[PDB]
C-alpha cells in the first residue's frame, strides 16, 4: 500500500573559521632581554577552504612613542618571507617575533571576513 | 577555539533583537569575549548594543550574544545599511607577549519592503570599462560583494559596491575582453558563475 | 592509545532523575453513513528511579475495556556496554526470526560505542618508516588526514561510508588500495555483539502456546575481514543451531553465507529435521548497485514459531529469492528494480512481487513513476498497478522571501491506473499556517466517486491535536496526544515523549520557545519538556532570546547534555528578572580599571567593568547599590518609573 | 491497516546546521525525530510490517537523499534516515527492519539527519522530498 509524500526542510549557513595557535594560552614566550627569533604558528581550521582563503589579516596594538611601527625596547613581527609587518594597517601562518632596541606586550590579530 | 556561527548577519527592520552564536571547543582554556558594533567606516557607534558586552567563559561552551537596535528607525528604508561587528577573544591568563583574536563580520540592516529579490539582485550588476579601470554600478538597493573577478585569464581584487552607488577597481591593459564575477548570498555561499554584461 | 573521533568518556553519561512519566494518546473516529464512535485511548506509564526504567503500556478501547498490553523494566550495564530488559520484549531477529517473549534479555547495545566505530570499516595497519602523514582517499575525498609518528600504526575509526569504493592509503610513500564493501552481517574486527535471551514465549496468535526457550546469538570479527556469527534457539521441543561466515571480497563485493539446522517437534508429535542455507551478496558500481539474497530451506525445516501451535498453515516454504538493482541516470534520475520470488514444497505456487520505479527531481518539481506487479497463485491473478506522483512547491511561482504565508504551501498530484479497472486522480495542497509552523493543513480532493480529505494537525506547547474530515461516508477523525512529566519540583505537560527526554528548567521565564523545535514553548511556570534527545551523545538545548520576555535575561542560554537511554535529564537555566541597564560608572572622575568585577547586593548578579566603565547589569531593582572590586567601592543608583518600560537603561553612576 | 490521513502529508524541519559540524564524510548533524501512526490495525492478516523509503539518491552516495541542484542550494549534503535502533536503512530498497503490530494503534519512530558526502560543505537550502511505503507480512 502506497503511503504519502514527505518533505524535509532545512538551511545550511557558513561560519567563521576556528582560530588558534600552536602555542597554548595565546602567549608567546619572548624570553629575557639582553634580535631573538621566536617563531609561532597561527592555525585556521574548522571551516571551508573558500571561507579560509577569503579573509583579511591585520595587526593592532599600542604604538611605541618613538617608533609607531613597533609594538610597545620593543617587539617586532616578521612573516615567512622576512618582511616587516607594520601595526595598525588595513591556513597556517608562521610569524617570527624579534626584540628591537629603541616587559609585557599585548597584540590584536584581526581577521576581517568578506 | 573561539568561533562565530555565521560569516554575516541579517537584521530585519523592526526586529527587537538578533542572536549570534559564539562557541569554544577547548576544555582547558579560559576566554574573555568582548564585543561591539562599528559603522561602515570603522567608528564606534551606540546605535547597536551587544549583550553581554564582555563576559568570561571556560571550557567547551557556547553562548548567544543579543544585538539590540537603538537607532529609533533613523536609517533609510529604501536601501540596506552596513555595519561592522567585532568580536574580541581575550585569553584570560594567570617575558610573555599576549595575543587576542578580533573577528570582524558584516551586519546588514535590511528594511521590510524591498523591490528586488536578494538572490535576483546578484545578476543585475552592471560594468563599465575605462582606459585602465573597471567600474561596477549596482541598480539594486541591496549590498553586493564581487568575488573571483576574472578579466580574461587573470583575477582582480574584490570590491564592495554600495547600493545606489559605484565602485572602481584596477584593470590591466592586457586583460581579456570577457569579464566574469561571483557574488555571495545571505548564507555565505558562492553563487554559480555568471557572465559579465556590459551597459 | 588513540581514541575514536567524537568519543564520550564513560563518566559524563547522566543517570537522570527520580521522576514519573505518562504518555496519553486518545483517538476517536466518528463514522457517518451510521454515527458510529470508536475510541482507541492509549496510556504509557513510566518511572525512573536510580538507573532503572520501568515502562507499562495499557490500551482502553470503546465502541458505540482496558487491556494491559506491555510491561517491562530496563537497566543499562555500562561495563558490558549492554542492556538488561527484565520483563516483556522481543528478540532482535538479526540472525534468527524475531519473536515476542517475556523474560530476561541481556543484549549488547551498539549506541554505547562512538559514532565513528559503527557499521563495517576495515582496520588499517602498516609500519611508517620515519615521521609521515596518512590520508584516506575515496572518490576524490580526504576521508581522514593526520600526522603519524614513526613505527607501526593502527587506524580503526574509519567512518562507515557504506558501498562507496576502495580506500587509497596515501602516506607521505607506499600508495596502496584497500577494498571496501559491506553487508548488514559484516562487522569490524574486534567488535562483538550478543543477544542472550531466556524466558517464556508469547505471540499475537491465540492458537500458539507458551513454552520456555533460550535464544543466544554471538557475532565476532576476525582480521582480514572475516566475520563469524553463530546462534542457538534451544527449546523443550525445538532445537535450532545456526552458523555462518561473512567476507568482504572487495572488487567482487561482499558475501555472507549461513546454514541453520533445526529439529522440530510438530503438534502431530512427529520429529522433523531440516536445514536452511542463506546467501547474501552485495556489490556496488556509472554506479549499478546489485543486491542478491537467497534462502533455500529443505523440506522438514521450520522456525521456532511453527512448533508453538496448539496440540492436535500447511504448505512450507522452499526458497526465497530477492533481487535489487539500482541504476542512477545522471545526477538527477534514479531507476530501481526489485523482485521477490517464493517457492514451496509439494506445489507450484509462486508468490512473485515485482516493483519498478523511476524518481526524478527538477529544481523544484519532483516526479516519480512506479509499476507494481503482484502474482499469487492463491488468487490466480496478477495485480498490475501504475502510480505517478508529482510534488510542486509554491515557491516556484511565488517570489523569493515573500511576505505571504503561502510560501510554505506545496501541491501534490497523484495518478493511479489499474490498467484493467477504475482509475484515480487526487490533487492536494499541504502546508503550514501558524507563525511557528505548528499548524499543518493537508486539504486534498480527488476522483476515483469524489474523495475529499482535509486534516488540520496542530502541535502546541501542551499537546498535539489533529482534526480530519473524510468525505466519500463522512468520517471525522479527532486526536489528542500529549505527555505529563512528574519531576521533583512539580508536574508539567507537553508533547508526547520519545525515549529520552530533557526537562528544561527556567524559573520565572515563561513562554520561551526552544531552538530547532516544532513550537515547543515553556509553560507559565517556566519548565518545558523536549520530545526527544539523542542517546549517549552531546546535545544542544538553547532558548530563543527573541521569544524571551523583555524583563528576563539568561546568563547561559545554550547548554549541552549527555542523556542515558530512558533517562529524564534536567537542564537548568538561570533566568534573571528585572531591568537591563548599561551603567557608565566612573571612579574619582576616571573610568574604572578594565577587568574589574561588579557584584549586586540587592539581587544576585555579576558583571565585568570592561572599557570606559560600561558595565552591563540584568535583573536590577529601581534602587540600591553594588560592590565593585579591582580596591572596593560602592555606588548607589536611582531609576525613573519608566525604566521598566524602557528595554535598556543607560545611567551615569559615580563611585565612592 | 489504514494510516492516519495527517501523516500522509507531513513536513519535517531540520533547522540550521553549522557547516564545520561536518569535518569529513560520514558525520551526521543533530537528529530530528518523526512518527507515523497506524490505526484500526488487524493482527489476524499480519502481525509484522516494514517501511520502504523510495526517493532520489545522491550522485556520490546511493544511501542518502538528494537536495537538488541550482543556485542557493547546498552541495555535498544529503538527508539520511535511521530507524529507532539507530541502524542505517538504505533508501530505495525493500524494508530490512520489521516491527510488530498491536491491535488498535501503532506508532513507528524514525530519525532524520544530515550526512556529508563531500570533503567540503557549502551553505544553502537543502530541501528534499521522499515517501514511505508499508510492506506487510
PDB file of C-alpha atoms in Angstrom, chain B residues 16-99:
ATOM      1  CA  UNK B  16      13.677  43.690  18.659  1.00  0.00           C
ATOM      2  CA  UNK B  17      16.991  41.815  18.750  1.00  0.00           C
ATOM      3  CA  UNK B  18      19.108  39.282  16.883  1.00  0.00           C
ATOM      4  CA  UNK B  19      21.052  36.302  18.221  1.00  0.00           C
ATOM      5  CA  UNK B  20      24.602  35.309  17.293  1.00  0.00           C
ATOM      6  CA  UNK B  21      26.310  32.110  18.438  1.00  0.00           C
ATOM      7  CA  UNK B  22      29.870  32.131  19.804  1.00  0.00           C
ATOM      8  CA  UNK B  23      31.430  28.768  20.650  1.00  0.00           C
ATOM      9  CA  UNK B  24      34.669  27.348  22.035  1.00  0.00           C
ATOM     10  CA  UNK B  25      35.794  23.714  21.844  1.00  0.00           C
ATOM     11  CA  UNK B  26      38.776  23.704  24.234  1.00  0.00           C
ATOM     12  CA  UNK B  27      38.308  22.255  27.714  1.00  0.00           C
ATOM     13  CA  UNK B  28      41.383  23.744  29.414  1.00  0.00           C
ATOM     14  CA  UNK B  29      41.327  27.423  28.430  1.00  0.00           C
ATOM     15  CA  UNK B  30      39.521  30.474  29.811  1.00  0.00           C
ATOM     16  CA  UNK B  31      38.454  33.188  27.370  1.00  0.00           C
ATOM     17  CA  UNK B  32      37.140  36.712  27.911  1.00  0.00           C
ATOM     18  CA  UNK B  33      34.864  37.595  24.987  1.00  0.00           C
ATOM     19  CA  UNK B  34      34.249  41.287  24.281  1.00  0.00           C
ATOM     20  CA  UNK B  35      32.013  42.632  21.522  1.00  0.00           C
ATOM     21  CA  UNK B  36      30.897  45.925  19.995  1.00  0.00           C
ATOM     22  CA  UNK B  37      29.335  47.290  16.807  1.00  0.00           C
ATOM     23  CA  UNK B  38      31.160  49.534  14.330  1.00  0.00           C
ATOM     24  CA  UNK B  39      29.833  51.624  11.456  1.00  0.00           C
ATOM     25  CA  UNK B  40      30.769  51.267   7.784  1.00  0.00           C
ATOM     26  CA  UNK B  41      33.860  53.471   8.160  1.00  0.00           C
ATOM     27  CA  UNK B  42      35.013  51.814  11.393  1.00  0.00           C
ATOM     28  CA  UNK B  43      33.883  54.264  14.082  1.00  0.00           C
ATOM     29  CA  UNK B  44      32.401  53.197  17.415  1.00  0.00           C
ATOM     30  CA  UNK B  45      28.652  53.845  17.488  1.00  0.00           C
ATOM     31  CA  UNK B  46      25.931  53.422  20.096  1.00  0.00           C
ATOM     32  CA  UNK B  47      23.210  52.648  17.543  1.00  0.00           C
ATOM     33  CA  UNK B  48      23.579  48.944  18.390  1.00  0.00           C
ATOM     34  CA  UNK B  49      24.049  47.270  21.768  1.00  0.00           C
ATOM     35  CA  UNK B  50      25.820  43.939  22.291  1.00  0.00           C
ATOM     36  CA  UNK B  51      24.702  41.914  25.317  1.00  0.00           C
ATOM     37  CA  UNK B  52      26.850  40.909  27.094  1.00  0.00           C
ATOM     38  CA  UNK B  53      29.446  43.492  26.019  1.00  0.00           C
ATOM     39  CA  UNK B  54      32.127  41.492  27.855  1.00  0.00           C
ATOM     40  CA  UNK B  55      31.856  38.127  29.591  1.00  0.00           C
ATOM     41  CA  UNK B  56      34.085  35.236  30.620  1.00  0.00           C
ATOM     42  CA  UNK B  57      33.806  31.577  29.643  1.00  0.00           C
ATOM     43  CA  UNK B  58      35.673  28.379  30.480  1.00  0.00           C
ATOM     44  CA  UNK B  59      35.927  25.001  28.788  1.00  0.00           C
ATOM     45  CA  UNK B  60      33.852  23.620  25.941  1.00  0.00           C
ATOM     46  CA  UNK B  61      30.966  26.072  25.868  1.00  0.00           C
ATOM     47  CA  UNK B  62      28.697  28.031  23.541  1.00  0.00           C
ATOM     48  CA  UNK B  63      26.772  31.244  24.198  1.00  0.00           C
ATOM     49  CA  UNK B  64      24.462  33.610  22.329  1.00  0.00           C
ATOM     50  CA  UNK B  65      25.081  37.347  22.074  1.00  0.00           C
ATOM     51  CA  UNK B  66      21.990  39.521  21.656  1.00  0.00           C
ATOM     52  CA  UNK B  67      22.166  42.523  19.322  1.00  0.00           C
ATOM     53  CA  UNK B  68      19.714  45.309  20.171  1.00  0.00           C
ATOM     54  CA  UNK B  69      18.970  48.322  17.973  1.00  0.00           C
ATOM     55  CA  UNK B  70      18.553  51.791  19.488  1.00  0.00           C
ATOM     56  CA  UNK B  71      18.625  53.565  16.113  1.00  0.00           C
ATOM     57  CA  UNK B  72      14.934  54.511  16.540  1.00  0.00           C
ATOM     58  CA  UNK B  73      14.225  53.882  12.828  1.00  0.00           C
ATOM     59  CA  UNK B  74      16.608  56.585  11.625  1.00  0.00           C
ATOM     60  CA  UNK B  75      18.267  54.566   8.854  1.00  0.00           C
ATOM     61  CA  UNK B  76      16.678  54.932   5.398  1.00  0.00           C
ATOM     62  CA  UNK B  77      14.063  52.342   4.461  1.00  0.00           C
ATOM     63  CA  UNK B  78      14.796  52.473   0.714  1.00  0.00           C
ATOM     64  CA  UNK B  79      18.078  50.534   0.902  1.00  0.00           C
ATOM     65  CA  UNK B  80      20.146  48.269   3.116  1.00  0.00           C
ATOM     66  CA  UNK B  81      22.649  49.534   5.679  1.00  0.00           C
ATOM     67  CA  UNK B  82      26.094  48.152   6.501  1.00  0.00           C
ATOM     68  CA  UNK B  83      27.777  47.747   9.882  1.00  0.00           C
ATOM     69  CA  UNK B  84      30.952  46.063  11.117  1.00  0.00           C
ATOM     70  CA  UNK B  85      30.516  43.637  14.018  1.00  0.00           C
ATOM     71  CA  UNK B  86      33.656  42.920  16.043  1.00  0.00           C
ATOM     72  CA  UNK B  87      34.201  40.020  18.444  1.00  0.00           C
ATOM     73  CA  UNK B  88      37.308  40.147  20.647  1.00  0.00           C
ATOM     74  CA  UNK B  89      38.526  36.976  22.380  1.00  0.00           C
ATOM     75  CA  UNK B  90      40.793  37.913  25.292  1.00  0.00           C
ATOM     76  CA  UNK B  91      42.572  34.817  26.686  1.00  0.00           C
ATOM     77  CA  UNK B  92      42.360  35.003  30.476  1.00  0.00           C
ATOM     78  CA  UNK B  93      45.891  34.369  31.754  1.00  0.00           C
ATOM     79  CA  UNK B  94      47.066  33.539  35.264  1.00  0.00           C
ATOM     80  CA  UNK B  95      58.809  37.770  29.123  1.00  0.00           C
ATOM     81  CA  UNK B  96      55.417  36.929  27.619  1.00  0.00           C
ATOM     82  CA  UNK B  97      53.522  38.515  24.723  1.00  0.00           C
ATOM     83  CA  UNK B  98      49.743  38.095  24.715  1.00  0.00           C
ATOM     84  CA  UNK B  99      47.669  37.750  21.549  1.00  0.00           C
TER      85      UNK B  99
END
